[PDB]
Design a protein around this motif. Structure first.
Motif, PDB file in Angstrom:
ATOM      1  N   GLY A 199       0.816  -1.200   0.000  1.00 43.57           N
ATOM      2  CA  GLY A 199       0.000   0.000   0.000  1.00 43.57           C
ATOM      3  C   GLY A 199       0.851   1.251   0.000  1.00 43.57           C
ATOM      4  N   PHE A 200       0.474   2.269  -0.764  1.00 38.00           N
ATOM      5  CA  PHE A 200       1.192   3.534  -0.697  1.00 38.00           C
ATOM      6  C   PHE A 200       0.198   4.675  -0.538  1.00 38.00           C
TER       7      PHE A 200
ATOM      8  N   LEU B  73       3.368   6.440   3.118  1.00 35.17           N
ATOM      9  CA  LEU B  73       4.066   7.655   2.693  1.00 35.17           C
ATOM     10  C   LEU B  73       4.769   8.317   3.869  1.00 35.17           C
ATOM     11  N   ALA B  74       4.149   8.287   5.049  1.00 33.45           N
ATOM     12  CA  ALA B  74       4.802   8.857   6.222  1.00 33.45           C
ATOM     13  C   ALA B  74       6.083   8.105   6.555  1.00 33.45           C
ATOM     14  N   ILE B  75       6.108   6.802   6.299  1.00 32.44           N
ATOM     15  CA  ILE B  75       7.327   6.029   6.482  1.00 32.44           C
ATOM     16  C   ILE B  75       8.384   6.422   5.450  1.00 32.44           C
ATOM     17  N   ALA B  76       8.006   6.469   4.166  1.00 31.16           N
ATOM     18  CA  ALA B  76       8.957   6.912   3.137  1.00 31.16           C
ATOM     19  C   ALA B  76       9.577   8.252   3.509  1.00 31.16           C
ATOM     20  N   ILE B  77       8.738   9.193   3.929  1.00 29.98           N
ATOM     21  CA  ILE B  77       9.191  10.522   4.309  1.00 29.98           C
ATOM     22  C   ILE B  77      10.104  10.445   5.519  1.00 29.98           C
TER      23      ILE B  77
ATOM     24  N   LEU C 176       2.222  15.225   7.365  1.00 31.92           N
ATOM     25  CA  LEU C 176       3.039  14.018   7.367  1.00 31.92           C
ATOM     26  C   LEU C 176       4.452  14.205   7.926  1.00 31.92           C
ATOM     27  N   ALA C 177       4.777  15.322   8.566  1.00 39.65           N
ATOM     28  CA  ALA C 177       6.161  15.481   8.997  1.00 39.65           C
ATOM     29  C   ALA C 177       6.313  16.433  10.178  1.00 39.65           C
ATOM     30  N   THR C 178       5.422  17.426  10.289  1.00 40.09           N
ATOM     31  CA  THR C 178       5.670  18.568  11.175  1.00 40.09           C
ATOM     32  C   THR C 178       5.791  18.160  12.642  1.00 40.09           C
ATOM     33  N   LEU C 179       4.868  17.331  13.145  1.00 42.53           N
ATOM     34  CA  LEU C 179       4.938  16.940  14.555  1.00 42.53           C
ATOM     35  C   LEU C 179       6.199  16.146  14.871  1.00 42.53           C
TER      36      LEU C 179
ATOM     37  N   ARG D 183       4.550   8.640  14.000  1.00 41.09           N
ATOM     38  CA  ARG D 183       4.589   7.192  13.834  1.00 41.09           C
ATOM     39  C   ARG D 183       5.545   6.802  12.709  1.00 41.09           C
ATOM     40  N   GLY D 184       5.618   7.620  11.658  1.00 42.06           N
ATOM     41  CA  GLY D 184       6.633   7.394  10.647  1.00 42.06           C
ATOM     42  C   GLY D 184       8.015   7.310  11.262  1.00 42.06           C
ATOM     43  N   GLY D 185       8.322   8.226  12.186  1.00 46.83           N
ATOM     44  CA  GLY D 185       9.608   8.170  12.856  1.00 46.83           C
ATOM     45  C   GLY D 185       9.792   6.888  13.646  1.00 46.83           C
ATOM     46  N   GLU D 186       8.781   6.524  14.443  1.00 49.44           N
ATOM     47  CA  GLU D 186       8.861   5.302  15.231  1.00 49.44           C
ATOM     48  C   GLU D 186       9.115   4.091  14.340  1.00 49.44           C
ATOM     49  N   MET D 187       8.448   4.023  13.183  1.00 50.67           N
ATOM     50  CA  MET D 187       8.576   2.832  12.342  1.00 50.67           C
ATOM     51  C   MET D 187       9.989   2.678  11.782  1.00 50.67           C
TER      52      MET D 187
END
Ligand SMILES: Cc1cc2c(cc1C)N(C[C@H](O)[C@H](O)[C@H](O)COP(=O)(O)OP(=O)(O)OC[C@H]1O[C@@H](n3cnc4c(N)ncnc43)[C@H](O)[C@@H]1O)c1[nH]c(=O)[nH]c(=O)c1N2
Ligand SMILES: Cc1cc2c(cc1C)N(C[C@H](O)[C@H](O)[C@H](O)COP(=O)(O)OP(=O)(O)OC[C@H]1O[C@@H](n3cnc4c(N)ncnc43)[C@H](O)[C@@H]1O)c1[nH]c(=O)[nH]c(=O)c1N2
Ligand SMILES: Cc1cc2c(cc1C)N(C[C@H](O)[C@H](O)[C@H](O)COP(=O)(O)OP(=O)(O)OC[C@H]1O[C@@H](n3cnc4c(N)ncnc43)[C@H](O)[C@@H]1O)c1[nH]c(=O)[nH]c(=O)c1N2
Ligand SMILES: Cc1cc2c(cc1C)N(C[C@H](O)[C@H](O)[C@H](O)COP(=O)(O)OP(=O)(O)OC[C@H]1O[C@@H](n3cnc4c(N)ncnc43)[C@H](O)[C@@H]1O)c1[nH]c(=O)[nH]c(=O)c1N2
Ligand SMILES: NCCC[C@H](N)C(=O)O
Ligand SMILES: NCCC[C@H](N)C(=O)O
Ligand SMILES: NCCC[C@H](N)C(=O)O
Lengths: 455, 451, 450, 451
Positions: free
Chosen positions: C16-17, C22-26, C79-82, C434-438
């Motif tokens: 899935g994208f 996408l938050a992970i890719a970023i 998708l990035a600021t927090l 969560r992107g960061g955590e992953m």
């Protein structure tokens, strides 16, 4: 209820026009004679002989600007009776109660009903006066009357009207006249006359007859930047979905109308006394300082909507020149080409910077909506055959505080007179043309015109 | 306006309490007798014999919660008359007109007047009934009356009241009784009695007498998370600027009250018929479904202010535990130690999920209200109910059920304000008072006024 | 991020994208940027990553890009600021790159149009076109054993069907992310018919059915959440002479709750507290906060819909005469649709424990988030013995039998973990954090060694 | 981090003032030297020799008007960096993230932070420049320098400042000067100087030292009807609960400030080019037409709050003359009696169209002037082109100098006092982020490009 006068008898009062100003007078006289609302009127038996002449075929409130979803610019508490007597049967709330709609309006939580609804309220009021209103009658002149032709004193007036369907002229004799004919469409003097150049006041009623196909890609321009211009520009994008619309204004931007609470007190009924008594210089300076309460201003929420619509276009295409709908600020129209068999006119635009390597833009448009406001001088023409009765030296009609025009006491009986309603901003304040003080003013007018007679 | 009945005569109606519910009945009776409002009244000779007993010394609307700046929770259109007849002389707009304030209120642009103003409006209304309202009279019992004792038929009632100033007991005879006594303070059962534990209803009137010095750094706790709690917590920070205040709630957060327009139609007067006719299970389910319209909720704007004040504290100090004013969610009080000469009580807190202590100078208990004080007031007529009822059962027209063989049809007792379970979430509020007052005048005086 | 040859052993494969992946890719991009993370100067080895997306290009619930629909969440929760406001993938930097930042400032809104926020995420996604294979629908995940002398699963083969050609492709990876969002939930009693369309396919399927925008169609909508209200409102603009009917089993549209204290449940730092609560505590909490997300409409749209109904009442006091009507506390008991008639017959009963003739029924009944269960069925035997469900740890890695699965291999879930991680899991609420955590969970050790 | 330059060296740039304007320049130079933000900054091993002189002892942003609860009048997106580069570490959002406060600010749902918070944000920025900012230094004059003996060309300037603690005079040499000293208090020319007549800029710092007892029934007057007047008038009623406050204004009403979306675009950074190139007559007309965006206007919400408080007084007493707090419109002060041993002054009022008060203090909220740079530069004004009586900045804010008297390597820049040539945004925060970047190009472009 008000019982009619036989047309041929001598009236006490004849009112020209049956819009909100005249309607509030009708309402105030009704309430003044109602002994349940006025303990005095128990002893009163005779009702004044009153008559209203209205040009439209039925009561209607700016029907050419009943744009879908437009809202009133004024609190409903300033309806045609409440500020004078909240117990009156003619309040907006009592109307809602009669329509079985009051609890539903309560859940709306708004002070600004739709223009369509406020029209229905005033139509509901007006229907209760059908026996004293003659519709389809356009008053054309007011001529002096003398019971003795060899007298040198005018003691009544003859009002002549043409029936809008037949053209027949009728004559009615009256002792007192109210002129309450609202405003006339003001068009820029440079514009030519053409069926495709339509003042905002005739938007809903004539534009659809010109541009019949609601899906066609018309080019429609709108001239002006006040509330009428904004409502037409916003509606055209919904009314003709594939159209390309262009808003042309000589200012740099739409500016928000002001009804912040302290500023808004200039509209209070009791201010009229203070405003009238100031000098002409103070009244002129004051009107200019409070300009943004009424003229050339748009309700903020509608400014915000139009800006959002434009922002969405910017999201889709960063190039403003490609947008379906555009605002061209600080422009004026210098030429309109309209002769020839083609459907579209060619509008020439230059900068509105004072005439004190400039560029000229052209537009081809199927129609031009001219939302350039109103004049309130049509009474001068209606009264032109009695203006010789003014005091020696007056070039304009002069209303007193009670709205009666000044007359030479040697030419006009003290029992006759003419009153003006709605055209007295310069002497009576920014509220004169609005609904703002109509309920209270109707009461004042009933005292002024019938006070001695009722007592 | 409405003329008095001699105290000793047989009344047509006696109302217990002169709050908005009784004031709406008085007003609607006035309006039914006003020939401007009913031409079918120009031919009415006798005014019904009506009487009101109120325990307070003057009309007053929750004066212990007249918090500076508090606003009404309902549109002024739902006043004591307009929804029944906007032509009434008792409308809020007409009151403003009489006070010379209507145009100024227009520029406020609000449907929600200050509670202080709406109090004055109803007080302005109430003054026109001064000849039929006995103030300072606390009703203590309602006892059955028989015109022929040799009979088994109750055909009137004796209402006994104690004067709050003298203690003298007065007796008044009436054929019909209306009970409109509002609510009583609901206190959590575990809390002890102490002059420092004060229910929200007595905030403005008792707390300042306890904490006289507005500059001392008092510790003040507040229990609850409804509108009363939010207002007291916010006000305490202004009233006692150096105090340390703590809001203790068992929920996780203050939640906004719901008056969105479709949801808000449950309060419409004509809904009372539909609600009354639903089953007991359906009536309970809907009240639970519509809970956020009234109970345990704060007006959104007041939440935002309280959150902003906490946010400002976070700006000054990122450590929440060092803040002057704090909110402790998901807590319940398990013990309050209060025996002693020392000024402060010790509050013990536990989790509200199915050691923390606070030492406080005062505890404001904002835990709502009960509405069953009529049960004690009516206990001496309880034997007149149909055999088998453990509770008073009002009909749609608010008249309670009585054994037809023990009570004459010309006598009866009506309930007002305590019928949420049978008549809907609008019963205890201002929502339907104007229409309901009109209905009551029909129910109780209709036949008398028609004849 | 540079591509990996298809046949190599991937470090991570994401199914899935949409926004979750996408938050992970970023976040992986930012973890490798020496401007944002000083340590990444000493990393020249990029992890071998690949994304498989079924749609032909990035698109964010395009079947519901209703004209004028707005975001339900502040743009600060992009998708990035927090995670890092200096990121180039913030919403403000996107506006700045499009030359629109000052104009957006004058909008004075925290809630962009859905059209805009979709374009913002599309702008992000295009910068990852080298690691995203579009038009690829993953069909199964199958266990791999690299050492013939061991029985230990130490990688996974993800096979996908190309949506245009039908060719099946297989990719080997050590770790898998499943972030496939939700599927359309239809009421079990409804039959299948081309005139009965779920809300997710409104903008894309209904126009093909009702081609003439001026015809007097009868169109019904089922439900009373945000999707039902947006479709009901839009249909009155889209088909102006239509007769639309909103059918709901609740008594009213109810307002969504994002008042400041209630809304703190969505804060990134709450996930730790929420995850550790008991199952009964978590279930009670989700029920107490329902009005934050499910079966609720933004107040402004309720007020708007109510105003339109009020205008009809002004014009005609008889509700049964209205062009557009709301039938509350109703349920659908039968749908007659077998027949040549253009219209179906909906049978209504009260929803407490009348018929319509309609050209179409829009079914706005929400979503399910359990499609990963079927996708993972060929690795289900790798769960701890006795578990009937996939169990994510706090770091979203699903529990597996350590005697059956190498510690170097594993499977992660994204977006379907509301019951264990809180009401923020399916939304945009915690995606940046969560992107960061992953990236730490999946690549932390590898990035340190590198 | 920018490293300091020895005090006695020839500086490349010296800035007078370290408020937001100078701070935005500091931030922009920092970002220009960051290879993460500008790729070229990798091959730059020469930091320009820069120095800032600020009269206050630490960074502070109108601390004399930090009225409790006052809010920014501008969206936080218009912070000191975002409109130039949202990736800068000096954005407001990044500051919140560094304070661990970003999610909590999000739940505030506001574009308008508290002035107290935005002050802290800029202080957090300012701390990262502490090695190049000399605090407690008040610049008194700028003097021309000639490095080449017997030459007639000025190629540097001497900036002299007095130490605020010692009075010592320091001299710093530079080739380029930035003047960024904000505005000075504007007092009506007719008012006398007296400790009881206090400009709004000194409200929070001086009035409390004068009126020490917060509970005394003072008569406190406020002059003006713009934002400063409204905030003080509103605050005085909370700060001195028993005072009698009187707002004196020559307009007829407080009027709302305009930031509606189309009107507000005059503040966009890219409008500066359009405005600058317009004629002098066109610029004056445009500034007059857009006045309500900035001067003599009050945030609408604050007007509505003040109106509400006055309405409540009308509820309590219909006689405006008996109110505790009053507004006197269309008045001007004609006389002040203040030479006396009595604690109160006598203010005499007349109509403001072409009555007396006795007050303990008069707050003068009559705005600001921006011409103090004329006095700071008076010893270099002979370098202007012949015939100029005023300093004229180019589009890039460098003032015009006679090319035969001043080397092209030397110059003086103005910031914030250039509204007449650069638009209503010049004195505000509106274009600071973009403008600082421009200033870095203007002043250091050639220098950074050679590096
Ligand atoms: C589109 C639009 C909308 C609004 C407003 C203006 C416009 C253009 N106004 C201002 C407006 O003037 C006001 O609402 C009333 O219409 C004023 O009532 P008058 O009766 O003085 O005017 P108005 O024009 O209403 O009435 C005059 C009447 O006289 C008739 N008439 C003219 N000449 C005649 C003749 N020779 N013989 C016989 N009859 C003749 C006309 O047909 C008309 O009925 C307003 N103000 C406000 O306070 N709040 C608001 O929300 C609005 N909304
Ligand atoms: C602080 C606060 C604020 C509000 C509200 C509650 C509270 C606690 N309410 C709900 C409230 O119940 C409602 O507004 C009215 O007070 C209802 O009036 P009742 O007449 O039923 O009783 P209410 O409590 O008003 O009055 C009953 C009266 O009976 C008297 N009484 C009791 N026992 C007696 C006895 N034995 N003998 C004699 N007299 C006796 C009392 O003294 C009292 O005056 C409300 N609702 C709404 O729709 N909008 C709103 O803004 C609010 N605001
Ligand atoms: C109309 C509408 C509007 C919103 C929202 C929902 C809906 C229906 N939401 C919630 C929403 O779930 C959230 O915004 C994101 O879409 C979640 O992203 P995910 O990537 O986890 O799922 P999402 O549905 O975005 O993405 C999953 C992706 O996986 C793909 N996929 C599925 N199966 C596959 C397979 N077998 N093989 C390959 N690819 C496959 C799909 O094509 C899809 O792109 C929301 N939340 C919020 O916080 N604010 C908001 O304003 C909104 N707005
Ligand atoms: C109370 C109040 C509140 C606001 C505002 C004004 C006022 C009065 N403003 C406008 C205001 O001008 C703007 O916020 C900035 O402060 C302008 O910054 P400057 O650095 O150019 O001047 P500013 O006054 O900020 O700073 C100049 C500095 O130079 C120093 N200085 C002066 N003379 C000196 C000397 N001889 N030697 C050494 N140092 C010297 C001063 O100490 C001061 O620090 C505003 N604008 C906006 O866009 N949004 C807003 O919300 C506000 N809020
Ligand atoms: N608790 C106040 C509720 C009032 C209700 N919303 C009504 O409109 O009657
Ligand atoms: N359905 C949208 C909810 C988003 C939530 N209010 C948040 O702030 O994260
Ligand atoms: N005094 C503040 C004005 C700020 C301006 N409206 C802006 O948006 O930049």
């Amino acid at each position: 209820r008000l019982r009619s006068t036989p047309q041929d008898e001598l009236h006490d009062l004849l009112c020209v026009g049956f819009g909100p100003a005249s309607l509030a007078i009708a309402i105030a006289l009704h309430d003044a004679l109602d002994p349940r609302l006025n303990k005095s009127a128990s002893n009163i038996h005779a009702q004044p002989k009153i008559c209203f002449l209205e040009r439209q075929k039925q009561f209607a409130w700016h029907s050419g600007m009943l744009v879908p979803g437009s809202k009133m610019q004024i609190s409903f508490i300033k309806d045609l009776a409440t500020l004078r007597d909240p117990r009156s049967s003619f309040t907006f709330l009592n109307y809602l109660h009669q329509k079985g709609r009051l609890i539903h309006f309560t859940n709306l939580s708004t002070f600004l009903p739709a223009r369509l609804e406020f029209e229905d309220y005033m139509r509901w009021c007006a229907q209760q006066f059908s026996d004293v209103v003659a519709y389809g009658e356009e008053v054309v002149e007011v001529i002096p009357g003398k019971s003795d032709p060899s007298s040198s004193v005018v003691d009544f007036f003859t009002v002549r009207s043409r029936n809008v369907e037949t053209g027949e002229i009728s004559a009615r004799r009256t002792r007192k006249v109210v002129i309450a004919i609202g405003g006339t469409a003001k068009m820029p003097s440079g514009l030519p006359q053409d069926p495709r150049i339509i003042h905002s006041s005739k938007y809903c009623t004539t534009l659809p007859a010109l541009l019949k196909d609601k899906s066609k890609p018309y080019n429609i321009a709108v001239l002006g930047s006040g509330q009428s211009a904004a409502e037409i520009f916003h509606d055209l994008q919904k009314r003709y979905p594939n159209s390309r619309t262009t808003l042309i204004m000589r200012d740099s931007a739409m500016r928000p109308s002001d009804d912040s609470p302290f500023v808004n007190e200039i509209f209070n009924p009791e201010r009229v006394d203070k405003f009238y008594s100031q000098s002409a210089a103070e009244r002129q300076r004051s009107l200019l300082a409070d300009k943004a309460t009424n003229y050339s201003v748009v309700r903020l929420e509608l400014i915000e909507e139009i800006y959002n619509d434009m922002y969405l276009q910017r999201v889709k295409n960063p190039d403003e020149t490609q947008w379906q709908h555009r605002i061209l600020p600080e422009r004026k129209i210098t030429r309109v080409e309209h002769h020839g068999p083609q459907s579209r006119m060619r509008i020439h635009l230059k900068s509105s910077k004072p005439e004190s390597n400039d560029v000229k833009e052209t537009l081809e448009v199927d129609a031009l909506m001219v939302a350039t406001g109103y004049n309130r001088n049509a009474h001068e023409r209606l009264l032109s055959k009695v203006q010789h009765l003014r005091p020696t030296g007056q070039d304009q009609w002069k209303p007193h505080r009670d709205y009666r025009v000044e007359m030479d006491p040697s030419k006009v009986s003290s029992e006759a007179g003419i009153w003006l309603q709605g055209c007295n901003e310069r002497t009576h304040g920014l509220s004169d043309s609005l609904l703002s003080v109509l309920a209270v003013r109707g009461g004042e007018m009933v005292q002024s015109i019938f006070g001695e007679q009722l007592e």
